[PDB]
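Appendix B. Worked example

We walk through a single record from start to finish. Start with the input: the chain for Outer membrane protein X, Escherichia coli, length 148.
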Amino acid sequence: ATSTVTGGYAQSDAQGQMNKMGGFNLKYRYEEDNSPLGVIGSFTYTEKSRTASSGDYNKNQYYGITAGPAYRINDWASIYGVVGVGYGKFQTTEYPTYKNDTSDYGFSYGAGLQFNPMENVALDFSYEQSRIRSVDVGTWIAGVGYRF
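Next comes the structure step. The output line below is what the pipeline stores for this chain.
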């Protein structure tokens, strides 16, 4: 039950203050009075690691595909439902075929807590956490778009 372009910044500091950047969360949908089901597409990248020497950290980027229906309900309080899982062949790249091979399920999702607009602004509060073996990240979404 949305229809606007949102975005901001997501800071990351894991491994003991040794990471920066991340990407922008883009949300765009269109479902209202027609069918209690839409297509929530979220394509974002993860600015983590990098190979600027001889690949001694990690390779490939992160890919997440979130999805969920549209249910407003309540007097006028939307509900959260943005689940996501991470996976791929990336973790160790500095040997003749070593990799890690630690098939795990990532927990990517936020909560619903949107306030009413005052003049022309709609801030969203969604908490994102990771669980890659042992990584701690504390991002603070600062969306600054419209609301529909």
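Two observations about the output. The longest strand covers residues 83-84. The beta strands are 83-84, 108-109.
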